[PDB]
Design a binder for this molecule. Structure first.
Ligand SMILES: *[C@@H]1O[C@H](CO[C@@H]2O[C@@H](C)[C@@H](O)[C@@H](O)[C@@H]2O)[C@@H](O[C@@H]2O[C@H](CO)[C@@H](O)[C@H](O)[C@H]2NC(C)=O)[C@H](O)[C@H]1NC(C)=O
Ligand code: NAG
Ligand code: NAG
Lengths: 420, 592
């Protein structure tokens, strides 16, 4: 069902479909070190990705249906240069007819043009003045389905946002050649990241789109805030999804000491451009291997690890005393060689029992493999203290809504630009 | 019918005067005088609490504009309600009973307002305390009048007005002694804070409690018993008065010679009693506007409204204009630094009342600086750093911030006026009010002193009026004090400094007090004993409403011109004196 599907291979970019589309990569196209399958494009002429199809799959028909899907990561727009600057990122227009994907300040735009120079556009807009955004500098699964009989639809993360009727356009003659390069951007320090680019010759319904979104999500591997792979030996700032206005802090070191959620968060502001909340506040959480049999540094599902809390540029250990009053066990930061037999192993969970993908979860376990519980927060006399409790496990068993057991790991990123 | 009722009322009025002259004046009258004096001192104290605690309560409760204005008027609105309510209820329940109820309500709500942490709850509690204290003056005067013989009634009633002055002095002294200790931060509850002004509120609620304690040991007025058909109780109270008086004199052997006293012939269930009380009170209020009392009532209404308007307007106008003069003097001393270029320095400071303009700061560290009335205009901060910055009345106008960090600063969003921030970071912002709250320091001291001078020039006027009320008369004292008040209002023009306005405030306060004394005695003497508290409470409620109107109008005229307040006060006082000169003379008459 897929005609074009750009994937990575041994030091090359290939097409998994049975067509062998020719791919030409420019001399300034970059790849990541850990997830090298994802590609990065910068604002230069040499930052070029070029794909050429066959004559038997060229979109030149009358009522032919089609759809496209990919993952896009766009950094934050920092100044007023980026305003009213629609620039194309994906191009399939020859002789002023075809389909294009472009970006503007807080907008992803899908445009299609016929041979009669008719314009039809579908736009997804995300705000940049939000406290914590789900789209700024984070991976977005964008899929567009075009029904030449009824209408064209945009989908982000499997959800419908906009849809526009496209009955007016009669015939589209898309190019034999597709362009991946920034075009029309006056910002010299602007770039994008794309991955998993697929084409289909039919309008995908919601079922197939959700299936593709979950299949490409790699639910067996944990993801950080930006959507990349979670890695051992990397400092991470901690964000609690249920209470995202406070950050993890400590007051003392030892069994008497505890860690809590201190707030409110600060703000990073560029006037009339962005008013975001600071993400580089709190104490860093390093993750260390304990029984990982994989050679890589990627944290996968059901991995038993250690947690180090970086306090005053010094590393400590996350542990509790299992035998104490109450169901919940208070989290504490101890000296690494002074942990003794305190419960410190954490099982990292990325999906539920049924296999449904969710956010990052930590399950504190003892040396007997007994579930002390999921790591969350509980309020003691108006102080949100970090605890490990079995109440979250009870709610999970009852298919209820847990409160405070979901976490996000925020490493320092260049696309965010906050001063630390 | 009605003529027979008037005849029996006159016979009772004459017999009561004869009985009172038999009883004499002595220890009982002075004991009741001091008890009702405590009741009036509570009233005098009540009108200073919010004015004295506003500077601290504004910062402690985040009070904005139109929230410090409604707090400065809430006592008068509560008083306006309470005066009418308790004056109406006093003729159906009794002077002492309604006085006890009102004083208890005032004490309870004044104690409860001392611990309230919010604003709306504080406003409600203070309004209800004003309601409780609104019925003090009418009931107190109409309760003391029914124990006095005609021989010396103006002097004995006029000596009752020193207690408002005593209450004002007490409030000023306690405010001076308690509030300036800002260090007191007693903690009972994490989210609640207990400062010194709440202790001041408690100490200001004390005199009402003392008044209740003193009033619990006094007897109800015999005239109230006689009007309602209760003869044995009235006879017992008159016998007690005579016995106490004679024991004080030194002849505890004579016998009360009165045997029978003329009395006025009287012709689910909780709701029934409430409806009956409401109907009776409305009947008394309407009969106050009767064919017999319609001219007297209207002239009393005019006099009370005009005098209250003028007095309260000027009394609130004087401190506001003193503050305005101080503000002008302060703004005249401001320093201006046009053009600066600062680079590569950790530069801290404590500047007050300054304006920097056209500055250019590059990589500057501002650690631990206190800003008071400091304004930066047309400045540019690049790669700057602000830490431990304390700010008060500080603004940034037409400023540009580039790559600057605000760490542990109270520079909230309202202090950047039409500014542009680029890549700025706000971290660990201090706790503070969302809007500007201003700050008062040493000047509060002087404020208290001014109050102590505004309620001490009153004393010569009180002494003169008390000594001379019977010798010249109520009408002439009232007219001669209103005319002098109008003359002082004219003199108001020749004042432009703080000392001049303090002198003018002292003069006006010392002049109008005799007029107020005379009006109190007149409105006590001009009504029958079955409508005294109703009419007096209605007139006092009108006084409080006029006080609200005059305070608002005269506050709106501060800093605009001196012609409007002078003209308003002089016109109102002239009309009041003209209406007062048409009043019937009550001197040398039985308390009918
Ligand atoms: C606002 O900052 C961003 C990010 O830079 C970070 O934040 C700065 C305050 C400072 O601490 C830097 O050291 C941080 O790296 C700027 O965007 C980047 O700027 C750098 C130059 O410092 C440049 O090399 C990158 O290419 C820029 N990235 C992008 C996506 O444009 C941004 O320029 C700053 N705003 C202004 C008006 O200069
Ligand atoms: C702040 O200024 C004072 C002078 O008023 C100076 O003595 C002090 O050293 C300064 N602070 C720092 C941290 O340099
Ligand atoms: C201050 O004046 C105007 C705003 O009133 C503004 O255009 C100007 O640029 C400002 N000055 C500087 C130095 O930015």
């Amino acid at each position: 069902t897929s005609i074009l599907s750009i994937v990575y291979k041994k030091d090359d970019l290939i097409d998994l479909s049975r067509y062998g589309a020719k791919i030409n990569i420019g001399d300034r196209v970059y790849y990541d070190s850990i997830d090298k399958n994802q590609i990065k494009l910068i604002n230069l002429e040499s930052s070029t990705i070029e794909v050429i199809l066959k004559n038997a799959i060229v979109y030149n028909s009358m009522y032919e249906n089609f759809s496209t899907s990919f993952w896009i990561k766009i950094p934050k727009y920092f100044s007023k240069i980026n305003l009213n600057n629609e620039y194309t990122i994906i191009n399939c227009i020859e002789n002023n007819s075809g389909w294009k994907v472009s970006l503007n300040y807080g907008e992803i735009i899908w445009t299609l043009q016929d041979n009669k120079q008719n314009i039809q556009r579908v736009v997804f807009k995300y705000s940049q003045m939000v406290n914590i955004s789900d789209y700024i500098n984070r991976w977005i699964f964008v899929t567009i389905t075009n029904n030449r009989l009824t209408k064209s639809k945009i989908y982000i993360n499997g959800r419908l946002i906009d849809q526009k009727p496209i009955s007016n356009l009669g015939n589209i003659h898309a190019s034999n050649k597709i362009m991946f390069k920034l075009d029309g951007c006056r910002d010299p320090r602007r770039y994008i990241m794309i991955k998993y680019f697929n084409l289909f010759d039919k309008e995908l319904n919601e079922k197939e789109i959700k299936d593709l979104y979950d299949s490409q999500s790699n639910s067996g591997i944990l993801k950080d805030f930006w959507g990349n792979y979670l890695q051992y030996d990397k400092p991470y700032y901690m964000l609690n999804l249920f209470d995202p206005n406070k950050y993890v802090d400590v007051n003392n070191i030892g069994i008497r000491g505890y860690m809590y959620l201190k707030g409110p968060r600060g703000s990073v502001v560029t006037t009339n451009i962005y008013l975001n909340s600071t993400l580089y506040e709190g104490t860093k959480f390093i993750i260390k291997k304990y029984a990982s049999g994989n050679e890589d540094n990627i944290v996968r599902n059901n991995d038993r690890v250690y947690i180090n809390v970086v306090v005053k540029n010094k590393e400590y250990r996350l542990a509790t005393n299992a035998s104490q009053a109450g169901v919940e066990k208070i989290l504490s930061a101890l000296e690494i060689p002074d942990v003794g037999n305190l419960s410190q192993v954490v099982v990292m969970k990325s999906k539920d029992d049924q296999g449904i993908r969710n956010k990052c979860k930590m399950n504190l376990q003892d040396n007997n493999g007994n579930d002390i519980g999921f790591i969350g927060f509980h309020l003691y006399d108006n102080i949100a203290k970090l605890v490990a409790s079995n109440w979250y496990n009870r709610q999970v068993g009852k298919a209820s809504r847990t409160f405070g057991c979901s976490w996000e790991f925020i490493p320092v990123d260049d696309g965010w630009g906050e001063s630390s | 019918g009605e003529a027979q009722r008037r005849k029996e009322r006159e016979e009772l009025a004459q017999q009561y005067e004869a009985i009172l002259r038999e009883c004499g004046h002595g220890r009982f009258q002075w004991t009741l005088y001091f008890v009702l004096g405590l009741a009036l001192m509570a009233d005098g104290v009540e009108v200073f609490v919010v004015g004295f605690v506003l500077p601290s309560a504004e910062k402690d409760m985040c009070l904005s504009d139109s929230n410090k204005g409604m707090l400065g008027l809430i006592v008068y609105l509560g008083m306006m309600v309470g005066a009418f309510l308790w004056g109406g209820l006093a003729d159906r329940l009794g002077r002492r009973q309604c006085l006890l109820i009102s004083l208890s309500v005032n004490s309870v709500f004044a104690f409860f307002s001392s611990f309230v942490q919010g604003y709306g709850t504080f406003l409600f509690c203070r309004l209800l305390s004003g309601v409780g204290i609104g019925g003090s003056i009418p009931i107190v005067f109409s309760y003391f009048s029914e124990f006095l013989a005609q021989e010396k009634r103006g002097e004995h009633l006029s000596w009752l007005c020193m207690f408002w002055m005593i209450g004002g002095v007490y409030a000023a002294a306690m405010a001076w002694a308690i509030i300036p200790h800002y260090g007191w931060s007693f903690q009972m509850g994490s989210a609640y804070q207990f400062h010194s002004w709440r202790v001041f509120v408690l100490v200001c609620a004390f005199p009402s409690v003392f008044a209740i304690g003193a009033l619990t040991t006094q007897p109800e007025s015999p005239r109230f018993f006689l009007e309602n058909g209760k003869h044995d109780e009235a006879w017992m109270v008159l016998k007690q008065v005579h016995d106490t008086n004679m024991r004080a004199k030194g002849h505890p052997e004579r016998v009360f010679s009165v045997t029978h006293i003329k009395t006025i012939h009287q012709e689910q269930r909780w709701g029934v009693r409430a409806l009956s009380l409401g109907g009776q009170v409305w009947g008394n209020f309407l009969s106050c506007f009767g064919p017999e009392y319609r001219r007297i009532t209207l002239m009393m209404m005019g006099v009370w409204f005009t005098m209250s308007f003028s007095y309260y307007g000027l009394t609130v106008w004087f401190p506001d204009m003193i503050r305005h003069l101080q503000a002008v003097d302060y703004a005249s001393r401001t320093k201006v630094f046009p053009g600066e270029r600062v680079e590569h320095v950790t530069f801290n400071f404590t500047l007050e009342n300054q304006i920097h303009r056209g500055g250019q700061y590059f990589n500057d560290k501002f650690i631990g600086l206190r800003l008071k009335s400091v304004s930066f205009e047309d400045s540019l901060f690049e790669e700057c750093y602000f830490e431990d910055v304390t700010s008060s009345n500080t603004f940034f106008r037409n400023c540009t911030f580039i790559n600057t960090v605000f760490y542990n600063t109270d520079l909230f969003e309202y202090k950047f006026v039409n500014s542009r921030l680029i890549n700025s970071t706000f971290l660990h912002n201090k706790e503070g009010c969302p809007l500007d709250v201003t700050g008062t320091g040493e000047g509060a001291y002087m404020v208290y002193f001014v109050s102590f001078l505004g309620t001490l020039a009153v004393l010569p006027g009180n002494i003169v009026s008390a000594l001379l009320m019977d010798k010249i008369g109520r009408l002439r004292m009232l007219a001669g004090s209103s005319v002098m008040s109008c003359v002082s209002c004219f003199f108001l023009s020749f004042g432009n400094s703080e000392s001049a306005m303090i002198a003018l405030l002292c003069l006006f306060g010392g002049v109008s007090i005799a007029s107020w004394n005379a009006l109190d005695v007149l409105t006590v003497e001009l009504y029958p004993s079955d409508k005294r508290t109703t009419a007096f409470g209605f007139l006092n409620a009108l006084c409080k409403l006029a006080a609200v109107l005059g305070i608002s109008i005269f506050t709106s005229f501060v800093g605009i011109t001196k012609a409007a307040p002078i003209l308003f006060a002089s016109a109102a006082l002239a009309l009041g004196s003209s209406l007062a000169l048409k009043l019937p003379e009550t001197r040398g008459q039985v308390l009918q």
